[PDB]
Amino acid sequence: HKIPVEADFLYAYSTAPGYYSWRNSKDGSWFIQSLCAMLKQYADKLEFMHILTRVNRKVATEFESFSFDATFHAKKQIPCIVSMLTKELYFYH
Amino acid sequence: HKIPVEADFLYAYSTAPGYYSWRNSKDGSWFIQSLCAMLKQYADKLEFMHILTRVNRKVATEFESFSFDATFHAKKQIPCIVSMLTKELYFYH
Amino acid sequence: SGISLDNSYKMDYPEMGLCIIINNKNFHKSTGMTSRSGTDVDAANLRETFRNLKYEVRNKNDLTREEIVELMRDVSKEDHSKRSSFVCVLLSHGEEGIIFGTNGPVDLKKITNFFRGDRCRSLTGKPKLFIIQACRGTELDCGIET
Amino acid sequence: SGISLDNSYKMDYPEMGLCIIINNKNFHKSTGMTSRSGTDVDAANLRETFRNLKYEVRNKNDLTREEIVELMRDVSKEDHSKRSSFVCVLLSHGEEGIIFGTNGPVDLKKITNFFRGDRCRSLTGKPKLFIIQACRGTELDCGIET
Numbered sequence: 001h002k003i004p005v006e007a008d009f010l011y012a013y014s015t016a017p018g019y020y021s022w023r024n025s026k027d028g029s030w031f032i033q034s035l036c037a038m039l040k041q042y043a044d045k046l047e048f049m050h051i052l053t054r055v056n057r058k059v060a061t062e063f064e065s066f067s068f069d070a071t072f073h074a075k076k077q078i079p080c081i082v083s084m085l086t087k088e089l090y091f092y093h
Numbered sequence: 094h095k096i097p098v099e100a101d102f103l104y105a106y107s108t109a110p111g112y113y114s115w116r117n118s119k120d121g122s123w124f125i126q127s128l129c130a131m132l133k134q135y136a137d138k139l140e141f142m143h144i145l146t147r148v149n150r151k152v153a154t155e156f157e158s159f160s161f162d163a164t165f166h167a168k169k170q171i172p173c174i175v176s177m178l179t180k181e182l183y184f185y186h
Numbered sequence: 187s188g189i190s191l192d193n194s195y196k197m198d199y200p201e202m203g204l205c206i207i208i209n210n211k212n213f214h215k216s217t218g219m220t221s222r223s224g225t226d227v228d229a230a231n232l233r234e235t236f237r238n239l240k241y242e243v244r245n246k247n248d249l250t251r252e253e254i255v256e257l258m259r260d261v262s263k264e265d266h267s268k269r270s271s272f273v274c275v276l277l278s279h280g281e282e283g284i285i286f287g288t289n290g291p292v293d294l295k296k297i298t299n300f301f302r303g304d305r306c307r308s309l310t311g312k313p314k315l316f317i318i319q320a321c322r323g324t325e326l327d328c329g330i331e332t
Numbered sequence: 333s334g335i336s337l338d339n340s341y342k343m344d345y346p347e348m349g350l351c352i353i354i355n356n357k358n359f360h361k362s363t364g365m366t367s368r369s370g371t372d373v374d375a376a377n378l379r380e381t382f383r384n385l386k387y388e389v390r391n392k393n394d395l396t397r398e399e400i401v402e403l404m405r406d407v408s409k410e411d412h413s414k415r416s417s418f419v420c421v422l423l424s425h426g427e428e429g430i431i432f433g434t435n436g437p438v439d440l441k442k443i444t445n446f447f448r449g450d451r452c453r454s455l456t457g458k459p460k461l462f463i464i465q466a467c468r469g470t471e472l473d474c475g476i477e478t
């Protein structure tokens with residue numbers, strides 16, 4: 001007769017716990033760039049978790065940092081999908 | 094040419110961050126009970142994130158604690174799916 | 187009627203819902219935070235992307251920690267009865283579990299609590315999505331060649 | 333050949349992979365932890381469930397923090413070349429980011445680090461699943477009536 005108060009929440013983090021999150025001054029953040037591209041291409045075709053999975057792959061494979069500072073050079077990023085959802089989510093019907 | 098070292102990890106938490114995780118002495122934990130039931134019923138039919146989503150709904154709706162101690166009585170639980178996967182996962186092929 | 191399954195959220199309400207975008211680019215000097223160049227690109231991209239998904243987008247720029255909490259509180263107090271879901275996008279500096287207002291930090295938990303199933307009844311049973319573009323620490327992923 | 337898409341993991345390797353199940357029920361007195369009654373039910377359920385998915389299940393009972401780290405280290409050093417994935421199930425007491433051995437805590441990060449893409453090359457690009465049945469704190473969800 002009740003549901004958890006924390007149920008039905010989805011947290012789409014740009015990066016893994018404890019990690020840096022990369023942003024390009026001209027193109028925007030790696031994550032948001034990728035999220036919008038995948039939503040534009042798949043929102044009317046795929047369930048949300050699968051769209052977010054494509055976002056994870058796009059960020060993980062197509063981006064790598066470039067810095068004059070060796071400390072921040074050639075780094076990678078993996079987004080982090082945190083789901084407390086109880087049903088599949090489709091933006092269309 | 095590289096992928097994140099944290100990529101391709103999936104953490105299926107029994108409960109949300111900061112929360113208690115419920116277990117029944119006779120039937121086992123709410124989460125594991127539900128996870129095995131959903132894997133048995135859907136492993137040859139659904140993508141893993143969707144199976145885990147069914148697990149979230151089963152735990153969230155079918156379980157509620159009973160305790161002589163008001164502090165721990167009538168509590169609920171929502172599992173927490175944490176995905177750093179870069180592709181859909183099907184146990185079958 | 188025929189067999190009815192409830193495996194997917196009801197997303198055919200009159201409205202898809204709100205998409206609140208908080209874009210923090212300029213921070214106060216005492217905070218010791220730099221300007222987030224290129225963040226406006228993200229904000230615009232998100233506005234257009236969600237506009238096409240039929241969400242009622244509301245963009246907010248450079249909000250202090252107080253304004254963030256007040257905004258979220260006010261939004262959670264709206265009547266979301268005719269809305270299918272709720273979306274909040276946060277663009278700012280951050281640390282694990284924290285998002286930065288222009289003048290200080292805000293615990294993500296404080297923001298999301300306003301929308302708990304028991305605190306925002308018009309959203310109970312509906313998907314509440316929080317998209318967070320911000321650091322969750324300082325660790326750097328060196329990656330591995332494939 | 334025809335159009336090739338890589339939207340799903342390759343799960344047709346000769347073996348599905350290992351399913352390591354760590355079932356901690358009895359803890360040392362000084363730890364101040366109680367016996368996890370009913371945990372054997374979970375362990376058996378998991379063994380059967382993953383056995384039917386064709387995973388090479390290995391059950392381990394009441395491991396100290398040292399044995400957990402040693403087990404994970406040894407497993408990550410195996411040749412997983414012919415395995416499609418890796419599964420580890422942890423059943424024990426816990427707190428946020430921590431899993432308890434019978435004599436003390438183990439940071440989940442220490443366990444998962446052995447399998448990072450750069451530290452376990454035979455699992456690079458393959459799904460690494462960690463299923464955790466343990467508390468992540470003491471908060472209790474009061475729920476809301478629907």
Ligand SMILES: *CC(=O)CCC(=O)O
Pocket residue numbers: 020021022023029222277278279280281319320321322
């Ligand atoms: C490291 C941070 O504070 C967040 C990165 C950004 O998007 O500015």
Ligand SMILES: *CC(=O)CCC(=O)O
Pocket residue numbers: 113114115116122368423424425426427465466467468
């Ligand atoms: C609260 C805990 O330490 C974990 C609960 C359990 O499964 O024993």
